[PDB]
Every structure is written in C-alpha cells, then in structure tokens.
Amino acid sequence: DEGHITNCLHTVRWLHTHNLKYPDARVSGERLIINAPPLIPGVISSAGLPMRMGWAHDSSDINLAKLFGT
C-alpha cells in the first residue's frame, strides 16, 4: 500500500532531538536537531547521553510515525 507507506514517510520531516512544544502545544513553527553540548563537570545534562530522536505534529499521526521513528 504505497499510500499508507507514503503517509508514514511524511512523518520523518518532523523527527527532532529537542521538543519546542513540550510545555505548551500552541507553539507553531519548525523542528530542532542539535548534537549534545560539551560536558561541564559540575552540571547534569544531555552531554553524557547517546543520540536519540522523537516525534510531534498532528494528533492523528501517532501510529503512522511508529514505522520510522521507533
């Protein structure tokens, strides 16, 4: 089903490393993809963690995004 897979391929455009909408769903615009900052000895942060991505956009997609973003 090229249509089902096409709808799934489209979700890739909004995979991100950092989520600009987290505290408030009203924020509108582009995604953010950045490598973790250099480690600071006195601070707990993403600097000590491996690279991972997530997904946010329409409520409807949830299932269709799972093929490539898992």
Next chain:
DNA sequence: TTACCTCAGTGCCGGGATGTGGCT
C-alpha cells in the same frame, strides 16, 4: 466546518611639666 487521537581605700579629670626620638 469537521474528524481524529491518547494509558583608709577605689574611679574620673584638669593642667603644667619632664623627658624622649628624629631631622639638620
């Protein structure tokens, strides 16, 4: 406009004076 999607002491006080240490 709509559909979607989450697990005998003592204590101050004045005042003139003895003596001293640094500069020339």
